[PDB]
Amino acid sequence: TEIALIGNPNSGKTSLFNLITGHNQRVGNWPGVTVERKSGLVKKNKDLEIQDLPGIYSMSPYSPEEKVARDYLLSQRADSILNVVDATNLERNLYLTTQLIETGIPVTIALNMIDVLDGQGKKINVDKLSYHLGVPVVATSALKQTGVDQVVKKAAHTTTLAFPIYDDRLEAAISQILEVLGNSVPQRSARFYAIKLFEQDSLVEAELDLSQFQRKEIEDIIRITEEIFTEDAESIVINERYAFIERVCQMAESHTEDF
Ligand SMILES: CNc1ccccc1C(=O)O[C@H]1C(=O)[C@H](n2cnc3c(=O)[nH]c(N)nc32)O[C@@H]1COP(=O)(O)OP(=O)(O)NP(=O)(O)O
Ligand SMILES: [Mg+2]
């Protein structure tokens, strides 16, 4: 079982990797430490091979190091994404998370640096956060060495799909683009690609070898949807992503009992 450590730079990926595998890979207090993939067997379960990757802020990234993690993800090798999330910068970290879920590779969140959040006198409702994100979440600290074995066990158990649901009208366009795509994208990641094409992402547009006919249909779908939303395609998706994350964070900061 192949488990990939994916998350923003400086979120504690390698720190967790080292704890999990017994390795002593490079860890530092600045973003951009890890620059290539490192594999290692999980000590407590030798059937699992975990992968340390350079940090990434989104799936439309701006450095060669970020490209290593993106290419790795879209190569379809991973069985599990162990998404390492900085608990003290939750909203910013969840941007990538929502794109990761869209790849259809099951996501498990290591809600890391929980000890820092503790010292800030702050709290995250782990169960609400997991419920609204539709993924398992385990609070971890690579510093205090807590939750680490638990989150790996959980990630492993996901390899044996709910996505963030946006505005109906955007969902209608994503479904239309999915139809146009057919088998021209890997089935598991289809939604990730459909959304990126809606956004007119340069990388995805160059990567996929779509026919003129597919491209014209997608163009027409985008134009129709922009007129429906009275907003440009790029903004539609970014805003939907932001609104989803905002709702999620408000749930995550809510410690009231649900009756
Ligand atoms: C006391 N440690 C720190 C507390 C706050 C900010 C930085 C540090 C620090 O001395 O450095 C690393 C570490 O110990 C610290 N750290 C990691 N996990 C925890 C954690 O769970 N709690 C605390 N307090 N600090 C943690 O964060 C820093 C980043 O860790 P990684 O290099 O593992 O991050 P990455 O995701 O692999 N970056 P990249 O390769 O994608 O560029
Ligand atoms: Mg690292």
Nearest CA to ligand 1 atom 38: 10
Give CB contacts under 8 A, 24+ apart, made by 232-239. Answer: 233/198, 233/199, 233/200, 234/199, 234/200, 236/170, 236/198, 237/166, 237/170, 237/195, 237/198, 237/199, 238/199
Resolution (A): 1.9
Query: Tokens for 72?
Result: 């790795």
The ligand minimizing its distance to the Cα of 96 is: 1
Q: What strands lie across the sheet with 38-42, from one edge to the other? A: 38-42, 45-52, 2-6, 80-86, 107-112, 137-139
Specify the CATH superfamily of domain 1-165.
P-loop containing nucleotide triphosphate hydrolases (3.40.50.300)
Choose which residue among 86, 143, 145 to substitute to test ligand 1 binding: the one with the highest number of ligand atoms within 8 A of its C-beta.
143
Please identify, by atom number, the ligand 1 atom nearest to the C-alpha of residue 35.
40
Judge if the beta carbon of residue 28 lies within 6 A of ligand 1: yes
Q: Which residues pair with 45 in a beta bridge?
A: 42
Ligand 1: which atom is nearest the Cα of residue 8?
41
* CATH dotted code for 166-259: 1.10.287.1770
Number of CB atoms found within 10 A of residue 257's CB: 5
Q: Is the dihedral of CA 51, 53, 59, 65 positive or negative?
A: negative
SS3 sequence, 69-94?
A: HHHHHHCCCCCEEEEEEEHHHHHHHH
The residue contributing the CA closest to ligand 1 atom 31 is 12
Q: How far is the C-alpha of 234 from the C-alpha of 18, rounded, in Å?
A: 38
Helix H or strand E encompassing 139? strand 137-139
Q: Are 97 and 133 in contact (CB under 8 A)?
A: yes
Amino acid at residue number 72: Y
Q: Determine which helix (DSSP H) or strand (DSSP E) holds 138, and give its type and residue range.
A: strand 137-139
d(CA 255, CA 94): 19
Q: How many angstroms does the Cα of residue 223 sit away from the middle of ligand 2?
A: 41
**Is any atom of ligand 1 closer than 6 Å to the C-beta of 32?**
yes
Interrupted after residues, the chain (C–N over 2.5 Å) = 160
Is residue 10 within 8 Å of 88, Cβ to Cβ? no
233 C-beta neighbours (distance < 10 Å), count: 19
Q: Which residues are CB-neighbours of 100 under 8 A, at least 6 positions away?
A: 6, 59, 73, 81, 83, 107
Compute the distance between CA of residue 175 and CA of residue 81 in angstroms, rounded to an integer: 24
Q: Which two tokens stand for residue 127?
A: 């169960």
Question: Residue 137 is encoded by which pair of tokens?
Answer: 């979440």
Instruction: Determine contact, residues 112/141, Cβ cutoff 8 Å.
Output: yes
Query: What ranges make up the beta strands (E) of 2-134?
Result: 2-6, 38-42, 45-52, 80-86, 107-112
DSSP state at residue 185: S
Domains of the chain, residue spans: 1-165, 166-259
Q: Is 104's C-beta closer than 6 angstroms to any atom of ligand 1?
A: no
| 3-state DSSP percent of the chain in helix, strand and coil, to 5 | 50, 15, 35
Structure tokens at 119: 């010292």
**Do 62 and 56 contact (CB within 8 A), yes or no?**
no
Surrounding ion ligand 2 within 5 Å at CB are 13-14, 33-34
